[PDB]
Scaffold this active site. Structure first.
Site, PDB file in Angstrom:
ATOM      1  N   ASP A   1       0.780  -1.235   0.000  1.00 44.36           N
ATOM      2  CA  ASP A   1       0.000   0.000   0.000  1.00 44.36           C
ATOM      3  C   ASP A   1       0.808   1.280   0.000  1.00 44.36           C
ATOM      4  O   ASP A   1       0.335   2.307   0.470  1.00 44.36           O
ATOM      5  CB  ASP A   1      -0.978   0.005   1.171  1.00 44.36           C
ATOM      6  CG  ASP A   1      -1.919  -1.175   1.132  1.00 44.36           C
ATOM      7  OD1 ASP A   1      -2.133  -1.710   0.046  1.00 44.36           O
ATOM      8  OD2 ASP A   1      -2.430  -1.606   2.169  1.00 44.36           O
TER       9      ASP A   1
ATOM     10  N   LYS B   1       2.410   1.688  -5.381  1.00 43.61           N
ATOM     11  CA  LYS B   1       3.094   1.098  -6.529  1.00 43.61           C
ATOM     12  C   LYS B   1       2.390   1.240  -7.878  1.00 43.61           C
ATOM     13  O   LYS B   1       3.045   1.505  -8.901  1.00 43.61           O
ATOM     14  CB  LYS B   1       3.412  -0.362  -6.247  1.00 43.61           C
ATOM     15  CG  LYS B   1       4.461  -0.548  -5.140  1.00 43.61           C
ATOM     16  CD  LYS B   1       4.742  -2.024  -4.878  1.00 43.61           C
ATOM     17  CE  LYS B   1       3.525  -2.713  -4.282  1.00 43.61           C
ATOM     18  NZ  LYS B   1       3.166  -2.140  -2.957  1.00 43.61           N
TER      19      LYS B   1
ATOM     20  N   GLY C   1      -4.192  -4.168  -4.587  1.00 46.61           N
ATOM     21  CA  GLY C   1      -5.215  -3.242  -5.023  1.00 46.61           C
ATOM     22  C   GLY C   1      -4.502  -1.978  -5.407  1.00 46.61           C
ATOM     23  O   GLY C   1      -4.222  -1.163  -4.549  1.00 46.61           O
ATOM     24  N   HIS C   2      -4.125  -1.860  -6.670  1.00 45.56           N
ATOM     25  CA  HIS C   2      -3.418  -0.687  -7.164  1.00 45.56           C
ATOM     26  C   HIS C   2      -4.391   0.361  -7.741  1.00 45.56           C
ATOM     27  O   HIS C   2      -5.232   0.037  -8.582  1.00 45.56           O
ATOM     28  CB  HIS C   2      -2.401  -1.116  -8.224  1.00 45.56           C
ATOM     29  CG  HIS C   2      -1.411  -2.136  -7.743  1.00 45.56           C
ATOM     30  ND1 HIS C   2      -0.044  -2.035  -7.924  1.00 45.56           N
ATOM     31  CD2 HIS C   2      -1.609  -3.320  -7.118  1.00 45.56           C
ATOM     32  CE1 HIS C   2       0.543  -3.140  -7.421  1.00 45.56           C
ATOM     33  NE2 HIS C   2      -0.360  -3.956  -6.916  1.00 45.56           N
TER      34      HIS C   2
ATOM     35  N   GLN D   1       2.051  -6.161  -2.713  1.00 48.28           N
ATOM     36  CA  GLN D   1       2.364  -6.143  -1.284  1.00 48.28           C
ATOM     37  C   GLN D   1       3.674  -5.372  -0.982  1.00 48.28           C
ATOM     38  O   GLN D   1       4.049  -4.455  -1.729  1.00 48.28           O
ATOM     39  CB  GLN D   1       2.363  -7.560  -0.697  1.00 48.28           C
ATOM     40  CG  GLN D   1       0.993  -8.215  -0.625  1.00 48.28           C
ATOM     41  CD  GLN D   1       0.498  -8.762  -1.978  1.00 48.28           C
ATOM     42  OE1 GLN D   1       1.052  -9.726  -2.525  1.00 48.28           O
ATOM     43  NE2 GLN D   1      -0.573  -8.169  -2.496  1.00 48.28           N
TER      44      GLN D   1
HETATM   45  O1  LIG Z   1      -1.790  -5.956  -1.492  1.00 50.29           O
HETATM   46  C1  LIG Z   1      -1.903  -5.805  -0.279  1.00 50.29           C
HETATM   47  N1  LIG Z   1      -1.641  -4.611   0.373  1.00 50.29           N
HETATM   48  C2  LIG Z   1      -1.440  -4.502   1.737  1.00 50.29           C
HETATM   49  N2  LIG Z   1      -1.530  -5.531   2.602  1.00 50.29           N
HETATM   50  C3  LIG Z   1      -1.841  -6.668   1.968  1.00 50.29           C
HETATM   51  C4  LIG Z   1      -2.024  -6.849   0.604  1.00 50.29           C
HETATM   52  N3  LIG Z   1      -2.322  -8.148   0.287  1.00 50.29           N
HETATM   53  C5  LIG Z   1      -2.303  -8.726   1.450  1.00 50.29           C
HETATM   54  N4  LIG Z   1      -2.024  -7.935   2.550  1.00 50.29           N
HETATM   55  C6  LIG Z   1      -1.800  -8.394   3.846  1.00 50.29           C
HETATM   56  O2  LIG Z   1      -1.016  -9.623   3.839  1.00 50.29           O
HETATM   57  C7  LIG Z   1      -1.518 -10.496   4.831  1.00 50.29           C
HETATM   58  C8  LIG Z   1      -2.023 -11.803   4.241  1.00 50.29           C
HETATM   59  O3  LIG Z   1      -3.120 -11.592   3.331  1.00 50.29           O
HETATM   60  P1  LIG Z   1      -3.184 -12.511   2.043  1.00 50.29           P
HETATM   61  O4  LIG Z   1      -2.252 -11.950   1.046  1.00 50.29           O
HETATM   62  O5  LIG Z   1      -4.755 -12.483   1.713  1.00 50.29           O
HETATM   63  O6  LIG Z   1      -2.875 -13.934   2.254  1.00 50.29           O
HETATM   64  C9  LIG Z   1      -2.605  -9.744   5.564  1.00 50.29           C
HETATM   65  O7  LIG Z   1      -1.965  -8.903   6.493  1.00 50.29           O
HETATM   66  C10 LIG Z   1      -3.096  -8.871   4.436  1.00 50.29           C
HETATM   67  O8  LIG Z   1      -3.866  -7.771   4.904  1.00 50.29           O
HETATM   68  O1  LIG Z   2      -4.497  -2.604  -1.937  1.00 50.63           O
HETATM   69  C1  LIG Z   2      -4.586  -3.627  -1.310  1.00 50.63           C
HETATM   70  N1  LIG Z   2      -5.113  -3.609   0.002  1.00 50.63           N
HETATM   71  O2  LIG Z   2      -4.549  -2.656   0.876  1.00 50.63           O
HETATM   72  C2  LIG Z   2      -5.396  -4.924   0.642  1.00 50.63           C
HETATM   73  C3  LIG Z   2      -6.662  -4.913   1.468  1.00 50.63           C
HETATM   74  O3  LIG Z   2      -7.581  -4.133   1.146  1.00 50.63           O
HETATM   75  O4  LIG Z   2      -6.766  -5.694   2.433  1.00 50.63           O
HETATM   76 MG   LIG Z   3      -2.709  -1.289  -2.714  1.00 44.47          MG
END
Ligand SMILES: O=c1[nH]cnc2c1ncn2[C@@H]1O[C@H](COP(=O)(O)O)[C@@H](O)[C@H]1O
Ligand SMILES: O=CN(O)CC(=O)O
Ligand SMILES: [Mg+2]
Ligand SMILES: O=c1[nH]cnc2c1ncn2[C@@H]1O[C@H](COP(=O)(O)O)[C@@H](O)[C@H]1O
Ligand SMILES: O=CN(O)CC(=O)O
Ligand SMILES: [Mg+2]
Lengths: 431, 431
Positions: free
Chosen positions: A13, A16, A40-41, A224
Site C-alpha cells: 500500500d 506502486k 489493489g493498485h 504487497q
Molecule cells: O496488497 C496488499 N496490500 C497490503 N496488505 C496486503 C495486501 N495483500 C495482502 N495484505 C496483507 O497480507 C496479509 C495476508 O493476506 P493474504 O495476502 O490475503 O494472504 C494480511 O496482512 C493482508 O492484509
Molecule cells: O491494496 C490492497 N489492500 O490494501 C489490501 C486490502 O484491502 O486488504
Molecule cells: Mg494497494
C-alpha cells in the site's frame, strides 16, 4: 537501466500502481511476478480512477504489453471480472495482456480454505484478504495445484480438478465442518472462460529473455511490500509470496543478473492492514489524522489501515533485502499541516539494547519500542507540487534525513493520486 | 566477481558439491539457499569421500563460514546426524556453521505426509526423496509451519507444535488412514537439540549485506537443478523450491543486484532420479554404460538414476532462467571409450514442428522427440586430466559445440571426483 523493478519497501500500500503507470510511458512490458488479486493498485488520470487487483498497472497504455508472470497466483474469476470492467471503459485487455501457463490457479475452494483457516486461528487470525492466495501457493508448493497450462486439455483438467477438490472437500467438511465447494460449479465457471484465458498465454521467460537481448524497457510491478515477505517478513503475519526483489526472477523467469534498477516505493508514513507487529503504530489523534488525510482503507477489502510514522529501521531492512537503487516517496502531502513529524531511527529492545536492525518473525517484535527523531512539520500545502522549489524547507529536510538515515536517494516524489502530481528527480530507465 | 552462484543447469546431480568445495578456497562464506537434505553432495579429497546433504559444501574448510540460509527447509534430525558424523572425522561443524532463524523446520510428521501423498498418487508418484521437503514448504507457505526462530521459547514452541501436529494427525489418520506421528516423541527429539541449533543462529541477510559491503568472496551453493524448479520445472515432477538463480536472493536475503557470477554446473550427459519427462533418456546399452561408468545412483536414496544424452534445448532454458555466466562441465571422463557422442539440438513436437525451446509443465512434454547432432567419441582416457592439452580433439570439439549451441563458455572442466582432477580455465571470483 532497461529492467526496472518497482516494489513496496514497507507493508504494501505504498503506491506502486500509480508509479508503474507513470513510468511505463517508455516501457515495452510491465510484469506482475507475485501475489494475486489481494493487491489493489489505484491509478488516477485526469481525475479518472482505476483500481486494479490482478491486472498489471501498465494496462492503460496502448504501447505496453502487460504480463502476469508465473509467480502470480491467478484467479480466472478475478481476471474475467476485471477484464470486463476495463473493456467497458474502452480498455481492450485481451489485446494487451499476456499470461504464464505456469501461474497457479485460484479457484473457489481456495477461498473456502482461506476462510476456514482464518476462522480456525480465532483471534490469532492473520487478517488475510480472503482471496485464497495462501491456499493457492500451498497447492503450488505441494505440487497438486492446478496451473493455467492444465486448462489446455479440458478432459484431463476435469479429472485433475475432481481429485484436488475431492482432497480439499474432505478437510472442509470433516475437519473444518464447513460447506463443501461444489465440483460442478467450479468446473462450469472455469470452462466458461478457458478459451479467453488460454488465448493470452505466452512463454514469459523466453519472451523476457528476448526483450533483454533487444534492450527493451521492462517494468516489473510488485504487489504487497517487504515486511509481508513469506521468508523475510513478520511471519506468520505475512503474505505467501516473496514480495522482495528476489521474487522478480523467480516469478517471471528473467535471470537475476538482469535487474538494472530497483525502485523502492516509500510512503511518507507507515500503514498495515491485517495483524502483525508495527512499532511506530499511532493510536492517537495523529494516527486518525493520517488515516483520514491519506484515505487509508484497503483498495481490496475496504478495511481501515493502521497508521504510524515512517520507520527507518524497517525501511533499512527493505533497502538491504531488495538492493534498492532509489526510493519514490509517496503521500508526502498527507503530512501537510502537522506541527511535527517523526522518523523512527532505532529500536529499544525489551532487554534494554538499542538496535538499528529489525527482528525477523512476529514473536521477536513483541516488546520492541521505537526511538524517534522529531523534525519540524510544515503548514504549506505540498499537494500536486511538481517541483522541489514548491516544497517547504521542512519538507525538503524530512526528505534529506530519510536519505541520510538509509543511504538511498529519493529519486521520485509523489504529491497526489494523479499521474502528474509527481516530480521525477531521476528516471530509473535513465539511471 | 565477489558473489558467485553455483547451481545445477539440468535436473540436479550435476556435481555441485565438488565444485563449491573446490572454489571456496578463497571464499569467506558458502550459503545454501534452497532445498533440504534431499540433496546429496559428494566431496572427495585425497581419495577421502564426504557426502553432505543439508550441510553446505564449504564445511571442510577452516577459512569458510558455512551458512544455511532461510530458503532452506531444516531438519533438526538431519543436522544433528551430519554434525556428529563430521565431528567424529575431525570437522568442527558447530564452529563453522551458521543458520537462519527463518528456516522452516522439517519434523517427522512432514515425512509421514510426504510418504502418504506419494502413496496416494499411486503410479503417478513424483518419486520424491521421502524427506518431507514438500510438506515443509507447504507449511511454510500456509504460514502455519514452525521455523528455527520458534525454538527460542520452548514453552510456546510446545504449544505451537501441539496445534500443527493436531492438524496434520487428523489428516494422516482420518484421510490417509496412516499411522499418527506422536507429539511427545517429536517434542522430545526436538528439545534435545535446540540449544546446539539455536547457538548457530545468525541474521544471514544482515550478515550477507555486511560481507557485500566489505567485498568478501561469497559462494551460494544450489541444491537440485533447473528443470526441478517449482515454477519453471517439469511440474509437478519437480522439487518444491526454486532451484533457479532467483532463489539465491529469496533464500539468503542478499539483494538480487549483488549476484556477480552464476556458474551453471553441466554434467557431460543427463540424469534424472524420480519421475518426469526426459527427452534424451537412453534405455539401451549406452544408457547402461553411462550409469555404470558414472556410478549413477542418488547420494541420498541410492536410487538408480535415469541416464541420457546432454540436452542443449533443456540446457538453453537453464542458461536463460539463471543468467549463466559460464558452465562447469562435469563427468566428461565418463564418456571415455564411446564410439560416438550425441547432443540434442532441437525438439520435434508431436504436431510436427521442430522447436529449439522446451515445454513447461510435464504434460506438455508428452510426445516430444529429441533431434540430435552426432559427434565422434574418443578412446583416450580423460580421467584426472588437469589441462586441455591432455584432452583429445574430439573431446575439445564436444566442449566447443556445447559452447556454440548455448553461447555460454565452459569455464571449468572436471575429470574425476577428486578436488584436483579439474581444470579451471576461468575462475568465477576473478571473472
Ligand atoms: O496488497 C496488499 N496490500 C497490503 N496488505 C496486503 C495486501 N495483500 C495482502 N495484505 C496483507 O497480507 C496479509 C495476508 O493476506 P493474504 O495476502 O490475503 O494472504 C494480511 O496482512 C493482508 O492484509
Ligand atoms: O491494496 C490492497 N489492500 O490494501 C489490501 C486490502 O484491502 O486488504
Ligand atoms: Mg494497494
Ligand atoms: O538433490 C537432488 N538431486 C536430484 N534429484 C533430486 C534431488 N532432490 C530431489 N530430487 C528429485 O526432485 C523430485 C522431488 O523430490 P523431493 O525434493 O523429495 O520433494 C524427485 O524427482 C526427486 O528425485
Ligand atoms: O544427491 C541427491 N540425490 O541424487 C537424490 C536422491 O538420491 O534421490
Ligand atoms: Mg547430488
Amino acid at each position: 537501466g532497461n529492467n526496472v523493478v518497482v516494489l513496496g519497501t514497507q507493508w504494501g500500500d505504498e503506491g506502486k500502481g500509480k508509479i508503474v503507470d507513470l513510468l511505463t510511458e517508455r516501457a515495452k512490458y510491465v510484469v506482475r511476478y507475485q501475489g494475486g488479486h489481494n493487491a489493489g493498485h489505484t491509478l488516477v488520470i485526469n481525475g479518472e480512477k482505476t483500481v486494479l487487483h490482478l491486472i498489471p498497472s501498465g494496462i492503460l497504455r496502448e504501447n505496453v504489453t502487460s504480463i502476469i508472470g508465473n509467480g502470480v497466483v491467478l484467479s480466472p474469476a478475478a481476471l474475467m471480472k476485471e477484464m470486463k470492467e476495463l473493456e467497458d471503459r474502452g480498455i481492450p485487455v485481451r489485446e494487451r495482456l499476456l499470461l504464464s501457463e505456469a501461474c497457479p490457479l485460484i479457484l473457489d475452494y481456495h477461498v473456502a480454505l482461506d476462510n476456514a483457516r482464518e476462522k480456525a486461528r480465532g483471534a490469532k487470525a492473520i487478517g488475510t484478504t480472503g482471496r485464497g492466495i495462501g491456499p493457492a501457493y500451498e497447492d503450488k508448493v505441494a505440487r497438486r495445484g492446478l496451473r493455467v497450462g492444465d486448462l489446455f486439455d479440458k478432459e484431463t483438467f476435469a479429472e485433475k480438478l475432481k481429485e484436488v477438490m475431492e482432497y480439499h472437500n474432505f478437510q472442509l467438511v470433516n475437519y473444518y465442518k464447513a460447506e463443501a465447494v461444489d465440483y460442478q460449479k467450479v468446473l462450469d465457471d472455469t470452462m466458461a472462460v478457458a478459451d479467453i484465458l488460454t488465448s493470452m498465454v505466452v512463454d514469459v521467460s523466453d519472451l523476457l529473455d528476448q526483450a533483454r537481448q533487444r534492450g527493451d524497457f521492462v517494468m516489473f510491478e510488485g504487489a504487497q511490500g517487504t515486511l509481508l515477505d513469506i521468508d523475510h517478513g513478520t511471519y506468520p503475519y505475512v503474505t505467501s509470496s516473496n514480495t522482495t526483489a528476489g521474487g522478480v526472477a523467480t516469478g517471471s523467469g528473467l535471470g537475476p543478473r538482469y535487474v538494472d534498477y530497483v525502485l523502492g516505493i516509500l510512503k511518507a508514513y507507515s500503514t498495515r492492514v491485517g495483524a502483525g507487529p508495527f512499532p511506530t503504530e499511532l493510536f492517537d489523534e495523529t494516527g486518525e489524522f493520517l488515516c483520514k488525510q491519506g484515505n487509508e482503507f484497503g483498495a481490496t477489502t475496504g478495511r481501515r489501515r493502521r497508521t504510524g510514522w515512517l520507520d527507518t529501521v524497517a525501511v533499512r531492512r527493505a533497502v538491504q533485502l531488495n538492493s534498492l537503487s532509489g526510493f519514490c516517496l509517496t503521500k508526502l502531502d498527507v503530512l501537510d499541516g502537522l506541527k511535527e513529524v517523526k522518523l523512527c531511527v532505532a529500536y529499544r529492545m525489551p532487554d534494554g539494547r538499542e538496535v538499528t536492525t529489525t527482528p525477523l518473525a512476529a514473536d521477536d517484535w513483541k516488546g520492541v519500542e521505537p526511538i524517534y527523531e522529531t523534525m519540524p512539520g510544515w503548514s504549506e500545502s505540498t499537494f500536486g507540487v511538481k517541483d522541489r522549489s514548491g516544497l517547504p524547507q521542512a519538507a525538503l529536510n524530512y526528505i534529506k534525513r530519510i536519505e541520510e538515515l538509509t543511504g538511498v536517494p529519493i529519486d521520485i516524489i509523489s504529491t497526489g493520486p494523479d499521474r502528474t502530481e509527481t516530480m521525477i528527480l531521476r528516471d530509473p530507465f535513465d539511471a
